[PDB]
Structures are given as C-alpha cells and as structure tokens.
Subunit: 331 residues, 5 copies
Amino acid sequence: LVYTGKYREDFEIEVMNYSIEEFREFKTTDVESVLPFRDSSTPTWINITGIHRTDVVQRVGEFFGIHPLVLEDILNVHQRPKVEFFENYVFIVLKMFTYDKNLHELESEQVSLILTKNCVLMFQEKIGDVFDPVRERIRYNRGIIRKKRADYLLYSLIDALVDDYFVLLEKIDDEIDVLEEEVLERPEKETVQRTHQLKRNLVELRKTIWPLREVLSSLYRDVPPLIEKETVPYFRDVYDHTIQIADTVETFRDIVSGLLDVYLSSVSNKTNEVMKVLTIIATIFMPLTFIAGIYGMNFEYMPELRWKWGYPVVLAVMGVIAVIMVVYFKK
Amino acid sequence: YTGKYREDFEIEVMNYSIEEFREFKTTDVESVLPFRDSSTPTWINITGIHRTDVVQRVGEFFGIHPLVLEDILNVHQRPKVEFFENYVFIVLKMFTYDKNLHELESEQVSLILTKNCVLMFQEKIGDVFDPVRERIRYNRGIIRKKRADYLLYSLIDALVDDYFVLLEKIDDEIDVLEEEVLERPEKETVQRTHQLKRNLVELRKTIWPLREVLSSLYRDVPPLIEKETVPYFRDVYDHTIQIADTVETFRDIVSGLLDVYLSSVSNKTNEVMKVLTIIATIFMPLTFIAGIYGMNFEYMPELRWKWGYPVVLAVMGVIAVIMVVYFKKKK
Amino acid sequence: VYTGKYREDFEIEVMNYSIEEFREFKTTDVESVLPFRDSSTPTWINITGIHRTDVVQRVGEFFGIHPLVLEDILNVHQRPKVEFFENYVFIVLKMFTYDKNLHELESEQVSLILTKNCVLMFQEKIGDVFDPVRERIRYNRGIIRKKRADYLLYSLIDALVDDYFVLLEKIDDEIDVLEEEVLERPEKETVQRTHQLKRNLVELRKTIWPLREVLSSLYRDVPPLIEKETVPYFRDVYDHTIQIADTVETFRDIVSGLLDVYLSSVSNKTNEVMKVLTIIATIFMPLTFIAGIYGMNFEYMPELRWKWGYPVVLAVMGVIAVIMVVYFKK
Amino acid sequence: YTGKYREDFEIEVMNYSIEEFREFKTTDVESVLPFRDSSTPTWINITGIHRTDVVQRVGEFFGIHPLVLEDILNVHQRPKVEFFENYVFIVLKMFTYDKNLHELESEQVSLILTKNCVLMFQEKIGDVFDPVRERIRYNRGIIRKKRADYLLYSLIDALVDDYFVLLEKIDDEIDVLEEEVLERPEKETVQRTHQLKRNLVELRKTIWPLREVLSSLYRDVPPLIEKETVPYFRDVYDHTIQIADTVETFRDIVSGLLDVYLSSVSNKTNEVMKVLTIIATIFMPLTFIAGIYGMNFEYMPELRWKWGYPVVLAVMGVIAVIMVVYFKKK
Amino acid sequence: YTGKYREDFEIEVMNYSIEEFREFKTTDVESVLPFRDSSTPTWINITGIHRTDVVQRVGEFFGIHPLVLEDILNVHQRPKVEFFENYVFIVLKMFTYDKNLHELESEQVSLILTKNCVLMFQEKIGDVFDPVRERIRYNRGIIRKKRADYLLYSLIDALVDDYFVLLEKIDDEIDVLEEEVLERPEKETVQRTHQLKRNLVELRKTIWPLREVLSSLYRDVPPLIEKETVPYFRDVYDHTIQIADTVETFRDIVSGLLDVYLSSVSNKTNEVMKVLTIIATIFMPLTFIAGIYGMNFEYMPELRWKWGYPVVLAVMGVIAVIMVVYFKKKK
C-alpha cells in the first residue's frame, strides 16, 4: 500500500444517497459513518478526494473485503486503465485528462472505482471532476436516471469523461491550428521544438485510449453481475463513439507527422530566398570588377589614351551587361 | 459592446398575422416595447447593438440576465444555445467573403425569442433576411399561419442557404487557385492559399460546433411546440455534413497544392546554386590574374617580348573557356 | 436521393439455388422478385443501377425496410458499417479500383440487406468480383449449395476482401515504378505523384480501418441468423483487414523513405558542387589583395628596394594553394 | 511458358519403401508414367519446365486440370495452396543471394503429391534437396518408415532452412554495409543501402504471404490424412514468423542507417559551408582596402604623414583576428 | 562453447522443503547428482558454462539430449522452448546496460527442469535472483510449499522487473539525449542517438520470440503440474505487451528526436548563410568602385574636379547603410 502520486495534501469524502423519490447529499470524512450505507438498497454515491491515504482506503477495503493488491493498485498512479470482473463487485480503472492552454502539458489523474450492489465509489487524487452536471440530474430529479440503477449511472459517469475528450479535441485542434499557423508565418524554431513534446503528449494520449477501447468492449459482451438487454445495448453507443474518437486522433498524428517536413522545407525555401538575393549580387559586380582590373593592370603600351575618349567609353559598356541578365532572372 | 461598428443604428418591427401585416422603423426604444403583449408573433429588427441603452432597457423589459446582455455586447463568441424558462439565446454568425481579396467578415447575430417577440440583433447593415421580409410582407407560406416557433426557423433556413452560396464562392476561388497552383505557379500564391485556408478553418471553426447547436433544439424545445423544427434540423444537419466535408476536402486539397509549390522551389535551391557556382567559378581565378600586372616590381614582362600589349590575353582567355567541358558533366 | 454519377445503366438478376439444383434469370420486372422473398431456398438477387429511387423504395416497402435505410442506399458517400436488427442486416461496403496511367482511385458504394435466405446486391455500374463465386453456385462446386445465405454472403464479402489484396499489388505496382522513378533517374513532379499516392494511401485507411470493427460486429453477434456456424469463419477474414491495414501502414514508411531520396541526391550533389566552389574562391581572395598594394599610392615604397622581389613573390604564394589540396579530402 | 530457361531438361525418379530403395534417371516422358501405380513412396524430379508437351502429358496422365497445367508453364504466380481431391498444388519459391554483387535470383518450383508419388517442377539444375535424397537413398532416420506426407515436410524444412542461411548472406552484407556507413562514406552507398533492402522488400513480399501458405495446410490438409507431421509444421510455422521479424528488424535498421547517412551528408554539407563562410568573408573587406589606395587623385593624404606604409599593413591584420573572436558563437 | 567467458567458475545448489532449507555452493558434482532423486525441490546453479566436460557429465547422467547440451555451448540462439517427457529446455537472456556509456551486454540463460529440481546455467557472474534466494531462505510465501513449476515462475517474474528497471535506464539516457537536442545541439548526436536506437530494436528483437516462450509453457508443459499454469504465466505474457508499446514509444521518440535535431541543422545552416550573405553584398559593389578609380585611363576626372579625393569618400559609406534599412526583415 504505497501512494506514489504527487498529491498527499488534501483529503475529502462526499456521499450522495438517493432513490426514485428522495435525495440527500453530504460530506463526511468519517470512515465509520459510510459503512452502514453499503446495506442501503438505494443507490449510494460516494466520493473520495485525496486517495493518498493508505489507511483510509485500506479500512474501507477491510469492511468491503476488497482484495489487498486491488487496494494497492489504487494507490499506484502508474497504471494502465482496465476492468476486472468479480462475483460481487466490479474493478474499474479510469483516467481523467486535462490540458492547459498557455503552457503545453497534459496533466492527468487516475480514477479507479469499485461498484457492488448499489454502492458507487469514486476515487480522486485531488479536487476537480466532470461529474458535476451528472449530480444535477441526481439532485434535480431530471430524467430516468433515478429510475435506473447505478449500472446506468456508471455509464453517465463514463460518457461524462468521454465528452471531455471531445472538449480536448477542441483544444488539440486549436493548438494544431496555432502550430500550423506559425509554420508558414514564422520561420523560427520555438514552438517547433515544443511541437515534438506536444506530439509526444498526443502519442501518449492515444496510447491510453487504444487499449481503453478493449477495456470497454470487455463489459458489453460479458457483464455477469450487471443486468442485460438495457444498459449494454444503450451503452454500446458511446463504445461506438470512442472508436470514432481515436480514429480522428490517429488522423491528427499523421498530420503533425508530415507537418515537420513542411516547416523544414519552408526554412530551406526562405533560406534559398536569401540565396537568390545573394546570387544576383556577386554575379553582376565580379565580372565588371574583373574588367576594372584589366585597366588597373599597367603595361608598356596604352591605347586607352591613344584612342579618342578611352575613359568614358568604358563606363557605358559595363552598365549594359548587368541589366540584360535581370530579364533572365525572376523567371 | 466590444464591436467595431458604433456608427449605424436602426430598429425595425415587422408584426404580421395569418392574414394582414404591418411594419415600421422607429429609433425610439420605448416604442417597440408595447408590442410584446401582441397576440400575434412580433418580429423585431435591431441593427447597431452598440447602443447599450437599448440593451439595458429592453433587457430589463423582457427580464433578461445582465450577463446574457453582455453576451450580445461580446461580438466575439462561439455559437450555442442557452435554455431558459422564458427565452432561448442563440449566437449566430453572418459570413461574407469578397472574391477580390481573401477576406471574410463576421457579424454576430444573437437572438432572444420570448412570448411573441423575435429579436434579431445586427452589428451593421446587411443580411440575407431581405427576401424573408418579403414572405412576411406578401403572405408567402405557412410562416403567416404559424407563431414565432416557425418564424424562428424561417430565419434560420435563410442563414443556412447563405453558406451554400459561400461554398460556391470558395469553390469558385478554389478553381482559380487550382489554375494558380497546378499551372502558372508564383509567389504569394501560398499567402493567398494560407489566408484562404485560414478563413476556411475559421469557417469550420464556427460551423463544426454549430452542429451541436442544432442538436440542442433537435430533441428538446420545451416551451414551444416540437416535431416541427425537428425534421427541419434533421435536414439542416444533413447540409452541414456536406459543408464541412467539402471543407475537409479543400483542406487536403490545400495541402496537396501546397506540397507541390513548396517542394519544387526548395528543390530548385541547388539549381540556383548550380547557376551561381558556374558563374562565380570563372571570376575569382581570373580576377587575380588581371590584377597581377597592376603591381610594381623590378622587371617588366611587357618589354621582354615584342608587341608587349596583348601580354598573352587570348591564350588565358581560351584556358578560361576550356573549363566548360570539365563542367556540365554528370555529377 | 441518389447523388452518384451513374444514372444510365440498369440491370436486375435473380440467382436462386438449393442444396442440389440452381436457377438464374435477368428480368427488369420489380414485381417478380418480390414473391421470392418467402422462398426458403437461398435467393441471390442483383440490382445494378441503384440510381432509381422509385424501385429501391418499392422493393424496400415490400420488405418492410426503414425509409432512412433506403435513403442510406441512395447516398453514394458513406462509411462502411453494419446495422443489426431482428429481421434483416444492413451492411455498407465499397469497391475500389485504380488505373495505372492516371493516378486516381475510383469508388463505388455497395449496400446489401439480407433477410431469411434471400441475398440482395446493390450496384451502380457493371462489374464485380463475385463472378467466380457465381460459378460455384451454378456448377454446384463445394458446400456452397448446402450452406445458406449466412455463409454465402460471407463468401461474397471474403471475395471482396481478396480484391483489395489485388489492389495492394496495384499499389505496389506503382511503388515499383516509384522505386524506379525516384532512384533511377530522379525526376521532378514525382513528389507530386508521391503525395497523390500518399493521399490515396491515407484515403484507403478511411475505409479499411473502421471496417475492422465492421467485421468484428458480425463476429460476435448475428442476432437474426443462426450463430456458431459462420462465426468462426469470420475470424480469418477479420485477421485479413488487420493484415491489410498493416500493409497499408507499411506502405506509409516505405514511400516516406523514398520521398526523401529524391531530396537526398539533390542535397548530396548540392555540397558536391559547393565543395568545388569552396576551394576556388577562397584561395584567390588573399592573392588579389597583395598585388593591389604595389601599384597603389602610399608614402613608402620598399617593394622595389627588395632584392629580387619580383620572382620570389610569384612562387611563395603558389604553395599556399597547394597545401590546401593536402587538406582537401581529410 | 514465361520462364527464362529453355535450355536444360532432365527427369529423375527416386522410389523407396520402409526397407529398400530404387532410383533411375530417365528424361523420357512416357517412361515415368507407369510408376504412378507404385504403392511405394515415389519421388520424381522434373527439370526442363519449358517443355509444354512433357509436363502436360504427365499432368493429363494424372488427370490434372488443363488451365492448372498451363499455370505450371508460367513462372509468375503468388505462392499459395491449391486444395484438390487428392494432390495439393504449391509453387515453392527460392531466393539465392550472391555476396559479391547485390542480386536476388528467383527460381519457382511447383510440387504435386498424388498417391505416393512426388513431383518437383524445377526450372534449372541444383537444389538443397541433395542431402534429402541421401536419407531417401541411405535409409537415414524415419524418412523410410514414414511416407511422402512426412517427406513433404522434409522438403519444406530443407527449403526454409536455406532462408536462415539466406538471412546470414544478407546479414553478412549488412555488416559490410555497416562498414561503408560507419566509416569512409561515399557514392553508391545509398544504392547498396537500397539494393540490399530492395531484395529484402522483395524477400518479405514473398515470405509474408507464404506464412499463410503453411497455415493453409497446418490447420487443414483436406485430401490426405492428418494428426501426423502436422505438429511438426508448427515448428516451421514459427520459423516464418522468426524470419520475417528478423527481416522486419533489418528493414528498420537499413532505413535508419540511410537516415544517419543522409543526416551526416546534410551535417557535413553545412560543415563545408561553415569553412567556406569563415574563410571567404574575412578577406572580403581586406581586398577592398587595397583598391582604395590604388586610386589616383589630386590630393594624397598618404604622403602628408611620415612612414605609414607598415601602419596600414598592421591595422588591417588585427581586424581579421577578431573574426575568430566573432566566431565561436551561434 | 562459442561464448566469451571461459574464465569464471561457480556452482550453486539450493534445496528446500515445506519445513527446512539448505543453501550451499559445492564444486563436487557427484554430491549434487543424488539430490535429483530427492522429492524435495533442489535448485541448482551452474555459472561458467564454458566447461563442456561438466555439461557432458551432468547432462548425459540425466539422459539429456546431446545436441541440446551443445546448444547450450552456442551463445547465438533464439529464446525458445523444448518440451520432453521428463525435463524442459528453455533459452533465456539477461540484458544489461551501463550508464555514462553506450553498451548493451547480454548473457544467455539455459535451464533444464526435471522432477522438482531446477538447473540454472549462467555464462558470467551476476543475477537478479539474489533476493529471490532470500525469500526461499526465510520461508516467505507459498514458494516453499509449491513445486518447481511455481519456483521457476518465481524466477521468471524476477526477470521481468529486471527489464522494467532497464526501461527506466533507457528514459534516463533519453532525457540526457533530449537535453543534448533540446539545448545546444552539436555533432556526434546522431551517433549517440543511433547507439540507443541500435540497442532499442535489438532489445525487442529478442523479447518478441521470448514472448511465445511464455505462451508455449502456458499451453503445454506436459511433465509439470498444469494446475499451476493459471493466468499468472499469461500475466507475465501481458507485461511484455506493455514493453512492446514502451519500445514502440521509444522508437517514435528516437525517430522524432533525431528529426528535431536535424531540423535544427537547417536553422544552424541558415544562421550561417545569413551572415555569409550580408558580407559580400556590402563590399563587392564598393570594391568595383575602387577598382575603377584604381584603374588608369585617358581622361582623369580625379585631378580635373576640385576635391577629387574627399568627394568619393562620402558616397561609398552611404551605399552600405541604405541596404541596412532594406535588411533586418524577412528575406
């Protein structure tokens, strides 16, 4: 039982119990008070913020009889999300992703959950979640959520996280748009260096999403303890969506991949543009300077003074050759 | 009001019925207010929303939230749908692209439909609702026999058709760009292509999230009657699919057209250097030789041989020429 | 609404068979293919020229098909998928064809609705890869007669799968030319031809990659038809679309390598020209400077005062350009 | 017939049992025909595939499909498994690589195993089945007790084992190619980088679909018996995965190897440019100064001073020194 | 023996049961041979497998196949599984990387497990089974009660984490290699990048065929208890799949980092070309001027025009200045 996370600071527990009629929400850090709520027939939603506590999670696991290694996997922040089936409860690991717009970094928070009977356990490492509008329907008695059990509520929680990826796709696309904008406009390698790290966050993103597909698929075609013919068919809808999601993400990966050579060639293009300017310079003075060197060379005979006006006659022939090539240029 | 148009100001009210119709243009804010209690759906035109006194008065007259009033003042906003018990706030944009230069102006069109009032907030003069005003005037369609619920979409359908023409505007410029890239390529073509894509991405930047905007009033519409605009948005959503796909097609066309001109010029980099080289190679070695006799010594090679003015210039010239055979060869 | 480019040709053919015999005919009658719905024997029906929105509707209304599904058929631009029901199964397919001369891949959407034992094939123009399949249905070759429409349609789809393998050859045929074009005598505009191939390569992923789960959906479901029969046969074909996409993914790295080759030789021959230009200009730079000082105007002329100054200067600066040749190729 | 060998022609027949053995070399087509009814395991060598009359005569004597017999003439066909009623048709390919000159020669040999007879359609003389013939001749192992169904594996294993040596032939030249890249890089290195990879691409392009050739029988073998020699196929069935992974490994190494070379060339490109820059630029303003004094005006400020000729030569020298100080930065 | 270690010599034999325990290192072979007949699991180590006489002695005494005994001598072998009626021959590898340098040393490990006894064959000194021996020494877990089939598995899992630590060592070299590219990128970086790259694929080159090794044991193992072959063996087979993505990630990193480094070279080159450009453009046009007056002709305007010398000094300096204003922008 070792928590290798980055947040051992705050700790908070919130419990929301409700039926198809009544409703109650409260925040009790008392571990003993939330124990008899397991026997409640009504769906009991329990929040645990700050999963860093090795004694609290264990104590909760002791009363529920949760497997020791499972309690350790929760504390393990370095783990791929997956789902394990059991005779009583369901072991599920999820990952909440967040991306700041100013600085470019993908911050995350592992969220594991265990659902038995009608008990709902949401585990957090810190403050923040996207299940706030979900609590609204639980509070305002909105929709068929109350009439449906925690199995449908879990999906409402699953789809709530899925919708965040769409919002993330908005962020991803926006960052790409700004990134590809600087490619043609600014021939400077600054965000281009940050592009690889931004693309690194994109690769690691799909690296979690792709196996998460099979994580979901293991539920619908199985779910031994959960009910059937209702939840699974309706829930597969999101499973049909998450397939479409990463495929759009995979498309983004190929776009940024070949975008590097676009900027790379753009640098050489503007570099060549400098060379083209540099080209026409040394090609018009050097041959004419060569002529100036000829008259600069003294000899025993000088027909320049013998011929009529040998000085201004040279000033005319030089200026012509430098112009007749200009037409040939800019072709 | 964060807009750039605080010049023009105009308020028009076009109230109709199942038979007759009336219209008038009054600058008085208090004159367009008592038409709220009109049994028939009242259509109101508001051009030049820069005047905050109208936003404040009417806002407090219809009972509009101060932040919602600020949303109208905010000319930079993403299209969405705000559900309330009184009205429905929707952000819309009017795009106008000139074929002369790649530029697309965007005038935000907010709307607040409560009771029997239909508000159209314009930032400046110009819209596509002019032929729509005729149907309200000439009694054309079931727009007269229906309330503000159908009157709302009657405006939307015109705005939807505006993008179809815009697609033609782009497609026309695409064919021009196709004639500009595939053949007769030149400078600033990329700049025209970039700004076109910049407007193309910005186009979808409003249209793509506008899909879910249509989905907001697709399965809902709580206060007004439904199953009327539902098959409408069902057809409208089929339109925006082809729109973005036409955009997505052009987005890859842009890249396809870009890579050609980008790789070609970057490939001609060495070609320019090849020309620059063979021209510069016949300068530096010859330039020094011409400057040799421009020096003073103890002996003169001119008097060493008869007719010492040619100083063997023809021979050295030929030797400079023979280098060509050495060049031009396969590298 | 049919938005395709083929509203000309039209053909209807019905190929019914049993575990022993077989029958086939080509009639344009719409009311003749309808009473063959209740036929227990597997009935393969052809519909070429899907442009007719009235025929599809008429046939669709008789089968009790959802109006939108009929409209999905009319739509010629659609991603391949599978729609499960309690009666029929709507599956979207595609037929890709590439011409070697002008680099372009034409496409034709194939929709099908299989109920009971009846088989429906919806096309636009003439031509398909089900021709050798029809032979076994006609010549009674194998268990293609005994097995119903569950394995028949599977054999039809599997026949379509191998068509893309032939297309992969056609892609490789262009690669072999691309291998010849880029390397042997590097030519301009090849990058454009390369990008078009790359654009068509990624375009191919738009169909095949989601087609994986299309086969996977039929792999562990099939609610209306009998399961367990053709289910394990779906596995091999499901491994094909994965193997194909890997070959498509493989082509991405192959062409990308050749893409830089054309730029490699140019960049390689670039410095080759520069290396020659380098040693030429630099060595004559200090030499030109020296000879200018003598004939120039100064307040002191120790040059003529130097004993034998003329011959020594000419040869003392010659070695400087020679020692660089030793430095050359280091 | 699309073959390239219409020169040599030879037919050898080796027959054996669980006790004895017999062999004879008769190029006659009508002489090896009555050996079809031989209950004992028979092995027949068929070299001289150019003969359209000899091959088809033996083929039609066995009752083999005409078009199939016509396909034997063609030496251009994908390696696969043709399932029949008794015999199975597989065209095995062999790739020989000479280390000196980068070249991958391809000989395509087809086999037909009917009853107890074994056919081997060679294109030329020479194979790796020579030690295989020895065990048939010298009674070595269970090659005598077991029939041709097990011998067929010994034929395959003898062919596959050559590819392991073929990988060594490539790996040998890879290490040689490494020496050309790691040190002393030059022209044609990119060619050797490709020509070795070109044949390597051609190699896997044949082996990768040849992997499923094994799987076609390893999971089935419909005409003959099973449960024998089948688990032995699994050994080689892992070899084609072992080889391809080694091939795929080489494909990634060679690709990255050329990238290093291209990176080196581009790096050494600027390296020459850097030398060209720091040497040419420092003499540009120097030569300009000498031309100034070369001018002859009416007023000479030089003679106005007193012995400033070495002064000019000294002040210009220091300016060229700070260029190195101006260097060592980016 | 085709190895490089014919120097070191070490033999370790460890027997244990559900009650007692005994560990020792005896060079006497005839003392550990009857220990095979013991029902209690006897783990035996043979370091310095170069000695063919011992392999021929121990091997032929157990009836081990002669060619297999020679296969051990061959250090160039693919990791595989050889099933027999009594024992099982498995080829394994132990990779090790040293920091502050680029070198990946390897050591082939062959094992022959008969009855309950385990034979481990080493090439050189060193293993990660040191803490494993301690758990058997201190009676930790059910490793004492279970037989060799689980004992070998305990050795397998010990080898798994060894590469996991090595995966951390890779990233340690990456971050250093990254820093080399992230800031002040220089020559020989491609070489260092290749050193990791050449060892990157080489790592997975042996891992992939070592995966089916775990699978082959998971499917068959006829002589040992198949009850022990629970998904724990496939759990090990699941870890290597994560290694595949871990290596594949590094493959994308190495490919990307090398490109970013090479992309900077274009900026490195251009930076030099910018300085190289502005030099020749401000001297040669002025050099041509000095060459004219430096050249002698017929008519001399220098002595003709008043102040011939100071009048030329002014115009030359301005020409180099008027270009600066044109410069310092996008060329």
